[PDB]
Design a protein around this nucleic acid. Sequence first.
RNA 1: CGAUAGAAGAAGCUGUUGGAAAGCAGCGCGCAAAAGGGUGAUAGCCCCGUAUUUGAAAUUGUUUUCAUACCUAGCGAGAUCCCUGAGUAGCUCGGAAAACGUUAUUUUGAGUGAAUCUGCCCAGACCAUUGGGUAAGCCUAAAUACUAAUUAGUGACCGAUAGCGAAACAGUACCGUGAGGGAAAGGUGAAAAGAACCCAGAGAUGGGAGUGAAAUAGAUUCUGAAACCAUAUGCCUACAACGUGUCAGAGCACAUUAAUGUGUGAUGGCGUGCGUUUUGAAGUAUGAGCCGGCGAGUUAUGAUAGCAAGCGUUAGUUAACCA
RNA 2: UUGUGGUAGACGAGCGUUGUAUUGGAGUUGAAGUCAAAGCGUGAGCAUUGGUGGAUCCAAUACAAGUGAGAAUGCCGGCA
Lengths: 210, 59, 148, 114
Amino acid sequence: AKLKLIKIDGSFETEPVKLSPGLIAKELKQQPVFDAVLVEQASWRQGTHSILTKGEVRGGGKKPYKQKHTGKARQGSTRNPHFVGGGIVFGPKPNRNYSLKLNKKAHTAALHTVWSEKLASDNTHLVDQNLFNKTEGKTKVMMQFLKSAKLLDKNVLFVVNTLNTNLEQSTSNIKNVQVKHLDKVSVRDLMLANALLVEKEVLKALEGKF
Amino acid sequence: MKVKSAAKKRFKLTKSGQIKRKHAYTSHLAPHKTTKQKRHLRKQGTVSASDFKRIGNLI
Amino acid sequence: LNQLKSVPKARNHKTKTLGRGHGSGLGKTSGRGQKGQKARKSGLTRPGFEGGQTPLYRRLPKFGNARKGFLKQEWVVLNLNKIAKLKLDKINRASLIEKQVISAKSQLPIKLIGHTKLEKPLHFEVHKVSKQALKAVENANGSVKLLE
Amino acid sequence: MRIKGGKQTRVRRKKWLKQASGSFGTRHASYKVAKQTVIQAAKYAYRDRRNKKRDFRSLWILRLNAALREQGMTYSVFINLLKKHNIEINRKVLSELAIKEPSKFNLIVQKVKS
RNA sequence: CGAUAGAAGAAGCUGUUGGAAAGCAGCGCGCAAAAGGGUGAUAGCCCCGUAUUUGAAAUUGUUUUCAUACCUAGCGAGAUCCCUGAGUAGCUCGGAAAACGUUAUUUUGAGUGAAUCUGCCCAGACCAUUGGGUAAGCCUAAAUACUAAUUAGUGACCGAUAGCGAAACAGUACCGUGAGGGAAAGGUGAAAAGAACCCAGAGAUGGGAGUGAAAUAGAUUCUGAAACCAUAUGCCUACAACGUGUCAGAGCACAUUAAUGUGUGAUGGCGUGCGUUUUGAAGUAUGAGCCGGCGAGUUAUGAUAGCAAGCGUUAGUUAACCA
RNA sequence: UUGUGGUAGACGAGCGUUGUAUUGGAGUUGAAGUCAAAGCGUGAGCAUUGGUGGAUCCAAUACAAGUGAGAAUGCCGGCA
């Protein structure tokens, strides 16, 4: 179809730009997309979970309970996981794999299909540096843009290649929106926002790169 | 992954499995056997299905 | 799939529970027999050990290698059936690197092999050649350079 | 990641305690004995659901025979009286109740005399 | 180009309950800063801090340049001139390291012991040719791990049974003279603003009184479970052979999470617990005083098998490494 | 139609608990949690109301469990 630019007050243009048929995918592969979402989710583990094993506890190795003449377990160890001394014999480990072998063709297919269906979702909005330079970094003009865009429950992202200082000074005082570089985005982050503005120039780069 | 050398020196992998090995009772000597068996034990052997399963996880 | 919905289709299959009693199934029993050594933890005698019985490899002869301490030369075979799928003449290492055949940062000797009959004349370069392979290629009237 | 389930464990034990009560001694005031008694009570209830219908049948048979002996007839033949002839479907429990009904079982015993 | 005291640093009123509004609702502002914290519950407008602009007497880390050193640094013609790392390489008896359990290679505890670039050593015994280098003196940043730590930041880290034993003055106390073992417990309130007053008694203590929103906020101090100990509404039991309950159930007292309503039961029928092994315990096989909290199949690497998916038409895939 | 007895063991379908980003909500006009009740589920659970408590929690979809407690002459504590 076509897509045009929205001004700071909400005045859409009268001359949209046609969307080339080379940016739409007729195939849907949710499994690579879901795996990308999982591997993005599999990045919030700092590996801080750990406990003292049987040999890692600082305690006496003597036998608290003698073998005979006692009506309790033998238990030649002072501290044990079933005891109230503390620690688990296995417990959490800080050496979890956190490793998933990638497929470049699958990754590219997932990336391009999520791009195409975001384009086909019609939530994409045109944007350019011509307005990125016209702002001052104050979120007040961003506030006018958002009340004009009337979209706050969905995070709004701006795939950017220049990253003007005025543009990036915003999107922080208003927690709803954010700005992200074109390549640095992720499928999980892309669907997390679900609202997105695209530069007019990067369409050709996205189409060619696939 | 390590391979148990204790076994693989006696068995060699072939196509589609069927690991090939030499027949026993002859490496030391075969002094009380008929020529029929000796020339028929000259042919090599392949481990059985359960033996194949045991070799497979062993290697 | 969204923030509030991440349903799968067929994944995250059923696992086993070994410590949730018998209302959950297979509790203390843990599906490992009873009162046996194989039932004990860290059991499962070696793949070559049969629990006192003599290992089979201990009763079998040991292979001897004439090429002991030495290894075969790495001749990469160019099977004629599959090399016929792609069409290309004046075949050389400069082309094989592009054709996903030979390494781009190393030199590897090559071998020609195959059993499919063709007729177009080509240009071929290998270090080893097979009888029926060369016969089939020469019936195609092509040129083969057995590198010497 | 420390997972604590003390509240859930206590809730479970509490509802299991509230499943059954009303016992002498410290049988309803101890969770393990309480669940053991719940198990025994369920088994007892199943045992009743069988042996009590067995009872009811035998009990009506005995009650019907006791009334039958008063009028001069045995249970063995009277049940057969409805079977070989005068084929009716009245049940022994309903006939047992009709014994006490005024001028009703007299009609029943005079009808079988075809 | 930094650190070690620091300066600036922006955006709010009204009404309601609420103890308290900061919540909620109406009208605004504004954020290089809507990260955080506490301030009477749920505070962007209470504050700082925050991003940023800056500032440093003096210590003062790193980098660059200059003056000053240091060695550094060309090609030719000869001469068997002298020399180029001596008990050296090696040989022999027992070893050690090399993937090797002693073999090519290094060394020797012991003995013996050469050679001179022509020569010597190396080329998993050795040797011919040939290839490389000329051992038998020394040193070196870079990519090498780690934190006793000074500091900034983050935790699918834990929250007084956990987390280093170590949130309380924990290595405390205590114990064995001594090796060493080695625990326990935090939370008032909102600010003690700690219960003034009055009374019993020796006071402790307790009770009315009052403050305090609240004394279900009284110092055993956020809340305060059950087992356990008692009290009382009703039910019955002091003639009763009983895994002490179940299915019913007269009678007694009720009216509910409104449902053939419930609590209890004189009596009728039946009525030797659980976990584990042994063919097999009601078991006098064993373990349990009771209750509450903790408490035992997980992690890496590689393979196999199952399911599914991606991709391919000579496949998939990047290890390491770098932003 | 076989059935729905079946240990070992094979196999299948699940439920809840927390935090992870949610769409959302409630709460000094009472949240988590506690006690009781004369509810719904075959069940893992969920309510609803009443009482304390005065400040956090949950509904729905995937993630991970130091996740789900009946015995271990299981550990500690308290009470006999």
